[PDB]
Structures are given as structure tokens and as C-alpha cells.
């Protein structure tokens, strides 16, 4: 099935399977980060946790969440080396978009760029395939809520309930029958299920300082980085 250097580079097997980027699928589990995303009717929620080695860990560098523009923001998983560079590439694509085009970005074409970028790097195996997973939200008129996730395989897909990571198989499988059905989605309802899906694998109910939770609703379209005060207000609101 392997001829020469095939095992170490990217070509197609007898079945046409890639050997290198399937290692990139297990390249996400470094650090044990789990990011879940629940997009409601008028809102979209992101939830992620962190690991703290000791008290010297800085609270300013805690945030793993990234913000594309004032309207739209991102969340990354896997090795942080590929995530910080791929986010800076999203900064370059968004700044060049507003420059030459001069209007709002659908966030769909940004995910088209990153999907082709990670694919072009998957093409030639002499540069690192960049197996980091790209997850965003979106805000656009007349389309309601927008959430898009650019996978390292080179394609972009995202919807109301979508997530990627190590333990997302369990949680999202529960979110299959849990989300719909008929269930209507408010602000505190989408954030609640964002906690319950974390309570499926973990159920630690730890203080809000550990989670990194973004949320964006459409009243003022600008996304805001959350403060632990309002999450603590939602933590006592989810305890019955």
C-alpha cells in the first residue's frame, strides 16, 4: 500500500487515504482542549475550557478565543502553534477584504480562503499541512444567525449545533436529539445547553474563571468578550 516515502508524505493509498493529515486529526488532542458551539435563533454561543498548571498562569493570556473583526470572532483547537499563525492569516484576509472590496464580509468567503489555504498546504507535503481546526461565528443581514467551521481537511461547514474536538463526538451526539425536536432558543437557553453539553463529559460545575465562553446575539451586531461576572450570573441561574 506504501511505495517509498508514501508513508511520510501526502499521496493517495490503494483506497486513496492520506497518511499525513490523518495524523493531523490526532494532532488536535494536544492540550485536551474541547470547544463546543451552539447557535440559536438570534444568537450564537461558544464554550471552551482551559488547563491551569499553577498560579503563575497569567489571566490576560488565558483567552484562547480570537476575534476576526468587531462583528465576528473565532475559536481554535489543537496545537497553538498552527492556530496563532492561521488566525494572523485571517487578520490579513479580513483587512484585505475591507480594503479592496469595501463592504461587509459574509464570513463564508473567509472560510473559503482558509479551506483552500489548508488544502494548498495539504497539496505539497514539503511544508507543514497545518492540521489546526478553524471555527468561527458569523453576523450577516437577512441570513439570520451564521456559524461556520473550517476543518483542516480543506472544507468549510457549520450550522446551529456544530462542534469539533476530542470529546465533541459524545456531546454533539447527545445534542442530536436534545437540540431538535422543536426546542426554541433564547440567550440563556443557548448558553444553558452550552453548559449542559460540557456537563455531559465533565459535570465539574467549576467556577466561571476556567471556561472561555463567547456569545454573540443580534441587537448590537458587535461581538463582545465575556466577563466572568455575567457567566457567574448564568451559573447560579442554571442551578435548580
Amino acid at each position: 500500500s506504501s511505495a517509498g516515502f508514501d508513508r511520510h508524505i501526502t499521496i493517495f493509498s490503494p483506497e486513496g487515504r492520506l497518511y499525513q493529515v490523518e495524523y493531523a486529526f490526532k494532532a488536535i488532542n494536544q492540550g485536551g482542549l474541547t470547544s463546543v458551539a451552539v447557535r440559536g435563533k438570534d444568537c450564537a454561543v461558544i464554550v471552551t475550557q482551559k488547563k491551569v498548571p499553577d498560579k503563575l498562569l497569567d489571566s490576560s493570556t488565558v483567552t484562547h478565543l480570537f476575534k476576526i473583526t468587531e462583528n465576528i470572532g473565532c475559536v481554535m483547537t489543537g496545537m497553538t502553534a498552527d492556530s496563532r499563525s492561521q488566525v494572523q492569516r485571517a487578520r490579513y484576509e479580513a483587512a484585505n477584504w475591507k480594503y479592496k472590496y469595501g463592504y461587509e464580509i459574509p464570513v463564508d468567503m473567509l472560510c473559503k480562503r482558509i479551506a483552500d489555504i489548508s488544502q494548498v498546504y495539504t497539496q505539497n507535503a514539503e511544508m507543514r499541512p497545518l492540521g489546526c481546526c478553524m471555527i468561527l461565528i458569523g453576523i450577516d443581514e437577512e441570513q439570520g444567525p451564521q456559524v461556520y467551521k473550517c476543518d483542516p481537511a480543506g472544507y468549510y461547514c457549520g450550522f446551529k449545533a456544530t462542534a469539533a474536538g476530542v470529546k465533541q463526538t459524545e456531546s454533539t451526539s447527545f445534542l442530536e436529539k436534545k437540540v431538535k425536536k422543536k426546542f426554541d432558543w433564547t440567550f440563556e437557553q443557548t448558553v444553558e445547553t452550552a453548559i449542559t453539553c460540557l456537563s455531559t463529559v465533565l459535570s465539574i460545575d467549576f467556577k466561571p474563571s476556567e471556561i472561555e465562553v463567547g456569545v454573540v446575539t443580534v441587537e448590537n451586531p458587535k461581538f463582545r468578550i465575556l466577563t466572568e461576572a455575567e457567566i457567574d450570573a448564568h451559573l447560579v441561574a442554571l442551578a435548580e
Binding site: 479592496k100 472590496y101 469595501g102 463592504y103 463564508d108 468567503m109 473559503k112
Partner: protein, 220 residues
């Protein structure tokens, strides 16, 4: 060669003539200076015809691939930025006088195209050498938020006024109407200037023309 238009309440109405000649000699009475862009946007050419046509083909090229990739109706400012960027790189080497307007979901937009690339938004713009009397009729008789029918009368009278004034304006009248639910390109409209019948018959007959060699080349 005169292009002008006005943006009414619910849309945009533009106009142009067909006359492109040199001097007082009558050459081409029929020329189309209104060029295609996209369903929501049209374009009016002036100055150098061939250079502005290759420019509007590149702009229609960028808007064709982008709108087809996005699947949505693009904004007028998307092509305006590339229009003002390309013409600014030449600093006015290629003479470009155009009327950039269109009606999107955001409403009507109008931008004046100059060889340097300076663009400003106005309810009405006049380009070409017939922009003097057209601006005078506009500025004097224009009131904001007119309907579509009164805008057609204003454009018809303004373009027909610049005919006699300007030297190279006349022949057929072209109408350009842009709106959200409707796109109207109406050509021709009215031909005030004509040329009368011949004074006498010089019509040729056989026997006065000497032919040296007549070659026959059957086809098929």
C-alpha cells in the same frame, strides 16, 4: 458624446446620446455608450470609447466572478474601489469619463468617475462636453425625491437641451432606468436632428465605368 442622469426616489434614471463624430462632418450617428455591468448596475461611456470599454469589461469581469462565487447582489462600491484604484495608478493617462450608478438592496447609489479616480455621491451627475447646459437645467429645475415618470421627463428634456448646445451631442436619445424590481434599457428614444433628402439624382448607370478585370470565385 454626452452622458447624464438623475436619481429619483425609488431608483436611478440615466441617459446618453448616440452621436460620436469629429468636427462638423457627419460620420457615425448611431453609437451605444451605455454598457452592461450586472443586473443591478449599468455604465455610461464617454471620452475614449475603446479604452473605457476595456475598462468596463474588466469591471464586469471582476463583478461576474465575484457575484457568481458569492451568489448575492454586490454593492456598487465594490467595483468603485477597483475603478478608483486602477485609474488612480495611471494618474489620468487614460481619459475616463463614466457614470457609475445602480440600485441594490441598500438602495440607489451614484458615483462620478474621473480619470484620477475621485468619486462623490450626488443625486445627479453630468459627464462629457455637454455637461454645462445639462447641469444648468438640472441645478435649476431639480427637486429631490421625484417619482420615476417626472424623472423621465427631466432626463428627456435635459439631454435634448444639451443636444443643441453641445457640438457633439445629438442623433438618437438613449434611456437608462435602474431600480430594484425592474431594469430598463430603452434604445433608441427620439431623433431630433436629421438630414434632408438629396437635392438631385446622381445615381449611376452602366456604360460610364470601365472595368479592367472581373474575377469570379464560386464557393461551396
Amino acid at each position: 458624446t454626452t452622458i447624464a442622469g438623475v436619481v429619483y426616489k425609488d431608483g436611478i434614471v440615466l441617459g446618453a446620446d448616440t452621436r460620436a463624430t469629429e468636427g462638423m462632418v457627419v460620420a457615425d450617428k448611431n453609437c451605444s455608450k451605455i454598457h452592461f455591468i450586472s443586473p443591478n448596475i449599468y455604465c455610461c461611456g464617454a471620452g475614449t470609447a475603446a479604452d473605457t470599454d476595456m475598462t468596463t469589461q474588466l469591471i464586469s469581469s471582476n463583478l461576474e466572478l465575484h457575484s457568481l462565487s458569492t451568489g448575492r447582489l454586490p454593492r456598487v462600491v465594490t467595483a468603485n474601489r477597483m475603478l478608483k484604484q486602477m485609474l488612480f495608478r495611471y494618474q489620468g493617462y487614460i481619459g475616463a469619463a463614466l457614470v457609475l450608478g445602480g440600485v441594490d438592496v441598500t438602495g440607489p447609489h451614484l458615483y462620478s468617475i474621473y480619470p484620477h479616480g475621485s468619486t462623490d455621491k450626488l443625486p445627479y451627475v453630468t459627464m462629457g462636453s455637454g455637461s454645462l447646459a445639462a447641469m444648468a437645467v438640472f441645478e435649476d429645475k431639480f427637486r429631490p425625491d421625484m417619482e420615476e415618470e417626472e424623472a423621465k421627463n427631466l432626463v428627456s428634456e435635459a439631454i435634448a437641451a444639451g443636444i443643441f448646445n453641445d457640438l457633439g451631442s445629438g442623433s438618437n436619445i438613449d434611456l437608462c432606468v435602474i431600480s430594484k424590481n425592474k431594469l430598463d434599457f430603452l434604445r433608441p428614444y427620439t431623433v431630433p436632428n436629421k438630414k434632408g433628402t438629396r437635392l438631385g439624382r446622381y445615381r449611376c448607370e452602366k456604360g460610364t465605368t470601365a472595368v479592367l478585370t472581373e474575377k469570379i470565385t464560386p464557393l461551396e
